[PDB]
Amino acid sequence: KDSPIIEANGTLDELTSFIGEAKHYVDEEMKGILEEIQNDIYKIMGEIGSKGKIEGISEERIAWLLKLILRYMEMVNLKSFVLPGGTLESAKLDVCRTIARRALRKVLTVTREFGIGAEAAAYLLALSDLLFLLARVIEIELGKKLLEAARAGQDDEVRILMANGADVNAHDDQGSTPLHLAAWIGHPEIVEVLLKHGADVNARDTDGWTPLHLAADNGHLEIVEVLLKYGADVNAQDAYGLTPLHLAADRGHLEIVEVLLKHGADVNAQDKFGKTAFDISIDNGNEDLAEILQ
Protein backbone atom coordinates (compact mmCIF):
# COMPACT_ATOMS: atom_id res chain seq x y z
CA LYS A 1 0.00 0.00 0.00
CA ASP A 2 2.83 2.38 0.87
CA SER A 3 4.34 4.03 -2.21
CA PRO A 4 8.03 3.85 -1.10
CA ILE A 5 7.79 0.11 -0.38
CA ILE A 6 6.16 -0.65 -3.74
CA GLU A 7 8.70 1.54 -5.56
CA ALA A 8 11.61 -0.18 -3.78
CA ASN A 9 10.21 -3.62 -4.62
CA GLY A 10 9.76 -2.67 -8.27
CA THR A 11 13.26 -1.20 -8.51
CA LEU A 12 14.78 -4.29 -6.87
CA ASP A 13 12.88 -6.56 -9.25
CA GLU A 14 14.18 -4.47 -12.14
CA LEU A 15 17.66 -4.91 -10.66
CA THR A 16 17.26 -8.68 -10.54
CA SER A 17 16.03 -8.72 -14.14
CA PHE A 18 19.08 -6.72 -15.19
CA ILE A 19 21.28 -9.17 -13.30
CA GLY A 20 19.50 -11.91 -15.22
CA GLU A 21 20.26 -10.33 -18.58
CA ALA A 22 23.87 -9.68 -17.58
CA LYS A 23 24.58 -13.18 -16.28
CA HIS A 24 24.61 -14.56 -19.84
CA TYR A 25 27.93 -12.94 -20.78
CA VAL A 26 30.25 -14.23 -18.04
CA ASP A 27 31.92 -17.54 -17.24
CA GLU A 28 30.56 -20.21 -14.92
CA GLU A 29 31.98 -18.60 -11.78
CA MET A 30 30.47 -15.14 -12.13
CA LYS A 31 27.31 -16.84 -13.38
CA GLY A 32 26.96 -18.72 -10.10
CA ILE A 33 27.82 -15.59 -8.14
CA LEU A 34 25.07 -13.70 -9.94
CA GLU A 35 22.60 -16.54 -9.40
CA GLU A 36 23.09 -16.49 -5.63
CA ILE A 37 22.87 -12.70 -5.85
CA GLN A 38 19.46 -13.16 -7.48
CA ASN A 39 18.54 -15.42 -4.58
CA ASP A 40 19.54 -12.78 -2.03
CA ILE A 41 17.71 -10.03 -3.93
CA TYR A 42 14.56 -12.15 -3.95
CA LYS A 43 15.04 -12.66 -0.21
CA ILE A 44 15.27 -8.89 0.27
CA MET A 45 12.16 -8.37 -1.87
CA GLY A 46 10.25 -10.89 0.23
CA GLU A 47 11.44 -9.24 3.45
CA ILE A 48 10.44 -5.75 2.28
CA GLY A 49 7.07 -6.92 0.96
CA SER A 50 6.12 -8.08 4.47
CA LYS A 51 7.32 -4.85 6.17
CA GLY A 52 9.94 -6.83 8.09
CA LYS A 53 7.53 -9.53 9.30
CA ILE A 54 9.35 -12.21 7.29
CA GLU A 55 13.02 -12.78 8.09
CA GLY A 56 15.29 -11.73 5.22
CA ILE A 57 19.00 -11.90 4.50
CA SER A 58 21.62 -12.77 7.10
CA GLU A 59 24.99 -11.21 7.92
CA GLU A 60 26.78 -14.21 6.38
CA ARG A 61 25.71 -12.88 2.97
CA ILE A 62 27.35 -9.51 3.64
CA ALA A 63 30.48 -11.24 4.94
CA TRP A 64 30.59 -13.30 1.75
CA LEU A 65 30.18 -10.15 -0.34
CA LEU A 66 33.02 -8.44 1.52
CA LYS A 67 35.18 -11.51 0.96
CA LEU A 68 34.48 -11.25 -2.77
CA ILE A 69 35.24 -7.52 -2.62
CA LEU A 70 38.67 -8.19 -1.16
CA ARG A 71 39.30 -11.07 -3.57
CA TYR A 72 38.63 -8.93 -6.63
CA MET A 73 40.28 -5.88 -5.07
CA GLU A 74 43.66 -7.58 -4.77
CA MET A 75 43.56 -8.28 -8.53
CA VAL A 76 42.69 -4.74 -9.71
CA ASN A 77 44.78 -1.55 -9.89
CA LEU A 78 42.48 1.46 -10.05
CA LYS A 79 44.53 4.50 -11.05
CA SER A 80 42.19 6.99 -12.73
CA PHE A 81 38.63 7.39 -13.96
CA VAL A 82 37.80 4.98 -16.78
CA LEU A 83 35.14 5.33 -19.43
CA PRO A 84 32.45 2.70 -18.77
CA GLY A 85 31.83 0.04 -21.38
CA GLY A 86 35.25 -1.25 -22.40
CA THR A 87 33.59 -4.47 -23.52
CA LEU A 88 30.02 -5.75 -23.75
CA GLU A 89 30.28 -7.70 -20.51
CA SER A 90 31.66 -4.71 -18.62
CA ALA A 91 28.91 -2.48 -19.99
CA LYS A 92 26.19 -4.91 -18.92
CA LEU A 93 27.67 -5.23 -15.45
CA ASP A 94 28.04 -1.48 -15.02
CA VAL A 95 24.44 -0.95 -16.12
CA CYS A 96 23.47 -3.44 -13.42
CA ARG A 97 25.61 -1.41 -11.01
CA THR A 98 23.71 1.78 -11.79
CA ILE A 99 20.38 0.01 -11.37
CA ALA A 100 21.68 -1.31 -8.05
CA ARG A 101 22.47 2.25 -6.98
CA ARG A 102 18.93 3.32 -7.86
CA ALA A 103 17.49 0.43 -5.86
CA LEU A 104 19.87 1.33 -3.03
CA ARG A 105 18.50 4.87 -2.92
CA LYS A 106 14.98 3.42 -2.90
CA VAL A 107 15.86 1.09 0.00
CA LEU A 108 17.50 3.97 1.88
CA THR A 109 14.31 6.02 1.47
CA VAL A 110 12.25 3.07 2.71
CA THR A 111 14.56 2.70 5.72
CA ARG A 112 14.27 6.40 6.52
CA GLU A 113 10.48 6.10 6.30
CA PHE A 114 10.13 2.88 8.34
CA GLY A 115 13.42 2.13 10.09
CA ILE A 116 13.95 -1.28 8.46
CA GLY A 117 16.19 -2.55 5.69
CA ALA A 118 19.55 -1.16 6.80
CA GLU A 119 21.11 -4.59 6.20
CA ALA A 120 19.47 -4.57 2.76
CA ALA A 121 21.04 -1.17 2.06
CA ALA A 122 24.46 -2.46 3.11
CA TYR A 123 23.97 -5.52 0.90
CA LEU A 124 23.04 -3.33 -2.07
CA LEU A 125 26.07 -1.10 -1.53
CA ALA A 126 28.29 -4.17 -1.41
CA LEU A 127 26.56 -5.36 -4.58
CA SER A 128 27.32 -2.05 -6.30
CA ASP A 129 30.98 -2.25 -5.36
CA LEU A 130 31.07 -5.89 -6.43
CA LEU A 131 29.58 -5.12 -9.84
CA PHE A 132 32.06 -2.29 -10.38
CA LEU A 133 34.90 -4.65 -9.46
CA LEU A 134 33.55 -7.36 -11.76
CA ALA A 135 33.44 -4.94 -14.68
CA ARG A 136 37.02 -3.86 -14.07
CA VAL A 137 38.08 -7.50 -13.71
CA ILE A 138 36.51 -8.38 -17.07
CA GLU A 139 38.35 -5.46 -18.67
CA ILE A 140 41.64 -6.61 -17.14
CA GLU A 141 41.02 -10.17 -18.32
CA LEU A 142 40.45 -8.94 -21.87
CA GLY A 143 43.67 -6.94 -21.67
CA LYS A 144 45.51 -10.03 -20.45
CA LYS A 145 44.16 -12.07 -23.37
CA LEU A 146 45.34 -9.27 -25.66
CA LEU A 147 48.82 -9.53 -24.13
CA GLU A 148 48.72 -13.30 -24.65
CA ALA A 149 47.76 -12.81 -28.30
CA ALA A 150 50.53 -10.26 -28.79
CA ARG A 151 53.06 -12.69 -27.31
CA ALA A 152 51.76 -15.38 -29.66
CA GLY A 153 52.00 -12.89 -32.52
CA GLN A 154 49.34 -14.37 -34.83
CA ASP A 155 47.05 -11.47 -35.35
CA ASP A 156 43.53 -12.92 -35.50
CA GLU A 157 43.02 -12.83 -31.73
CA VAL A 158 44.65 -9.39 -31.66
CA ARG A 159 42.21 -7.90 -34.16
CA ILE A 160 39.11 -9.66 -32.79
CA LEU A 161 39.91 -8.47 -29.27
CA MET A 162 40.83 -4.94 -30.33
CA ALA A 163 37.58 -4.61 -32.27
CA ASN A 164 35.81 -5.99 -29.18
CA GLY A 165 37.01 -3.02 -27.11
CA ALA A 166 39.92 -4.54 -25.19
CA ASP A 167 42.22 -1.86 -23.78
CA VAL A 168 44.97 -1.12 -26.30
CA ASN A 169 47.40 0.33 -23.72
CA ALA A 170 46.91 -2.25 -20.98
CA HIS A 171 50.15 -3.45 -19.42
CA ASP A 172 51.50 -6.53 -17.68
CA ASP A 173 52.86 -6.30 -14.13
CA GLN A 174 56.26 -5.73 -15.78
CA GLY A 175 54.78 -2.66 -17.49
CA SER A 176 54.92 -3.96 -21.06
CA THR A 177 52.15 -2.82 -23.40
CA PRO A 178 51.01 -5.05 -26.28
CA LEU A 179 53.19 -2.82 -28.45
CA HIS A 180 56.21 -3.90 -26.40
CA LEU A 181 55.35 -7.58 -26.86
CA ALA A 182 54.69 -7.14 -30.58
CA ALA A 183 58.06 -5.43 -31.00
CA TRP A 184 59.77 -8.15 -28.97
CA ILE A 185 58.31 -11.10 -30.89
CA GLY A 186 58.68 -9.48 -34.31
CA HIS A 187 55.19 -9.28 -35.83
CA PRO A 188 54.84 -5.81 -37.38
CA GLU A 189 51.29 -6.13 -38.74
CA ILE A 190 50.03 -6.16 -35.16
CA VAL A 191 52.20 -3.09 -34.54
CA GLU A 192 50.54 -1.10 -37.33
CA VAL A 193 47.02 -2.25 -36.51
CA LEU A 194 47.52 -1.23 -32.87
CA LEU A 195 49.18 2.08 -33.74
CA LYS A 196 46.25 2.99 -35.99
CA HIS A 197 43.80 3.43 -33.10
CA GLY A 198 45.88 5.73 -30.89
CA ALA A 199 48.50 3.41 -29.41
CA ASP A 200 51.05 5.47 -27.49
CA VAL A 201 54.43 4.99 -29.18
CA ASN A 202 56.17 6.48 -26.12
CA ALA A 203 54.89 4.03 -23.50
CA ARG A 204 57.36 3.37 -20.68
CA ASP A 205 57.75 0.01 -18.96
CA THR A 206 59.16 -0.59 -15.48
CA ASP A 207 62.56 -1.49 -16.99
CA GLY A 208 62.96 1.81 -18.85
CA TRP A 209 62.48 0.19 -22.26
CA THR A 210 60.26 1.92 -24.78
CA PRO A 211 58.84 -0.09 -27.70
CA LEU A 212 61.35 1.56 -30.03
CA HIS A 213 64.39 0.84 -27.84
CA LEU A 214 63.55 -2.84 -27.43
CA ALA A 215 62.49 -3.20 -31.08
CA ALA A 216 65.82 -1.76 -32.23
CA ASP A 217 67.49 -4.08 -29.72
CA ASN A 218 66.05 -7.06 -31.63
CA GLY A 219 67.30 -5.68 -34.94
CA HIS A 220 63.84 -5.39 -36.51
CA LEU A 221 64.19 -2.69 -39.16
CA GLU A 222 60.56 -2.78 -40.25
CA ILE A 223 59.00 -2.35 -36.81
CA VAL A 224 61.47 0.41 -35.91
CA GLU A 225 60.82 2.37 -39.10
CA VAL A 226 57.06 1.97 -38.63
CA LEU A 227 57.44 3.38 -35.13
CA LEU A 228 59.52 6.28 -36.45
CA LYS A 229 56.97 7.31 -39.07
CA TYR A 230 54.41 7.23 -36.24
CA GLY A 231 56.28 9.92 -34.30
CA ALA A 232 58.58 7.70 -32.25
CA ASP A 233 61.00 9.64 -30.03
CA VAL A 234 64.30 9.30 -31.88
CA ASN A 235 66.24 10.30 -28.74
CA ALA A 236 64.16 8.89 -25.87
CA GLN A 237 66.30 7.84 -22.90
CA ASP A 238 65.84 4.67 -20.86
CA ALA A 239 66.29 4.09 -17.13
CA TYR A 240 70.05 3.97 -17.80
CA GLY A 241 70.04 7.11 -19.96
CA LEU A 242 70.58 5.16 -23.19
CA THR A 243 69.24 6.57 -26.44
CA PRO A 244 68.15 4.28 -29.31
CA LEU A 245 71.49 4.79 -31.06
CA HIS A 246 73.48 3.42 -28.12
CA LEU A 247 71.65 0.09 -28.07
CA ALA A 248 71.68 0.07 -31.87
CA ALA A 249 75.47 0.26 -31.75
CA ASP A 250 75.49 -2.35 -28.97
CA ARG A 251 74.47 -5.08 -31.42
CA GLY A 252 76.00 -3.33 -34.43
CA HIS A 253 72.91 -2.76 -36.58
CA LEU A 254 74.32 -0.38 -39.17
CA GLU A 255 70.99 -0.05 -40.99
CA ILE A 256 69.16 0.80 -37.76
CA VAL A 257 71.91 3.29 -36.93
CA GLU A 258 71.65 5.08 -40.27
CA VAL A 259 67.84 5.10 -40.11
CA LEU A 260 67.97 6.66 -36.64
CA LEU A 261 70.54 9.21 -37.82
CA LYS A 262 68.21 10.10 -40.70
CA HIS A 263 65.50 10.80 -38.11
CA GLY A 264 67.48 13.00 -35.71
CA ALA A 265 69.38 10.59 -33.47
CA ASP A 266 72.21 12.22 -31.50
CA VAL A 267 75.49 10.44 -32.23
CA ASN A 268 77.24 11.88 -29.16
CA ALA A 269 74.54 11.43 -26.51
CA GLN A 270 75.65 10.67 -22.94
CA ASP A 271 74.17 7.84 -20.90
CA LYS A 272 74.51 7.37 -17.14
CA PHE A 273 77.96 5.79 -17.55
CA GLY A 274 78.89 8.55 -20.02
CA LYS A 275 79.30 6.26 -23.05
CA THR A 276 78.58 7.70 -26.48
CA ALA A 277 77.33 5.67 -29.43
CA PHE A 278 80.34 6.58 -31.58
CA ASP A 279 82.65 5.55 -28.74
CA ILE A 280 80.60 2.37 -28.33
CA SER A 281 81.28 1.58 -31.99
CA ILE A 282 84.98 2.33 -31.52
CA ASP A 283 85.06 -0.01 -28.51
CA ASN A 284 83.80 -3.13 -30.31
CA GLY A 285 86.22 -2.73 -33.21
CA ASN A 286 83.65 -2.13 -35.96
CA GLU A 287 85.00 0.58 -38.22
CA ASP A 288 82.33 0.99 -40.91
CA LEU A 289 79.76 1.85 -38.24
CA ALA A 290 82.08 4.50 -36.79
CA GLU A 291 82.62 5.93 -40.28
CA ILE A 292 78.84 6.12 -40.74
CA LEU A 293 78.48 7.60 -37.24
CA GLN A 294 80.98 10.34 -38.14
Author numbering: 23 to 316
From the article:
Here, we describe and detail the use of sub-particle CryoEM averaging and present updated reconstructions of DARP14, a multi-subunit tetrahedrally symmetric protein complex. DARPins are small, ~17 kDa helical repeat proteins that feature variable residue loops capable of selective non-covalent binding to other proteins, akin to antibodies. Variants of DARP14 and similar scaffolds have since been generated and used to bind and image small proteins, such as GFP and KRAS.
For the DARPin signal, we turned to sub-particle reconstruction coupled with signal subtraction. Therefore, for both the trimeric and subsequent monomeric reconstructions, extended parts of the core cage were kept intact to allow for sufficient signal to remain for classifications and local refinement. Stemming from the previous trimeric particle dataset, further subtraction and sub-particle reconstructions were made whereby each monomeric subunit was isolated. Using the same methodology as in the preceding run, the coordinates were shifted from the trimers to the center of each of the three monomers and combined, tripling the dataset. Since the monomers lack symmetry, our final reconstructions were therefore made using no applied (C1) symmetry. In contrast to the full complex, the resulting trimeric and monomeric DARPin maps feature vastly improved high-resolution information, particularly for the helical extension linker and residues close to the cage, facilitating model building and demonstrating the effectiveness of reducing the effect of high symmetry on averaging. The resolution range for both C3 and C1 was comparable; however, C3 DARPin information looked clearer closer to the core cage, while C1 DARPin looked clearer further away from the core cage. The latter residues of the DARPins remained at lower resolutions, likely owing to a significantly higher degree of flexibility in those regions and possible unwinding of the structure. Several residues can be found in close proximity to the core cage, potentially allowing for non-covalent interactions and/or covalent disulfide bridges.
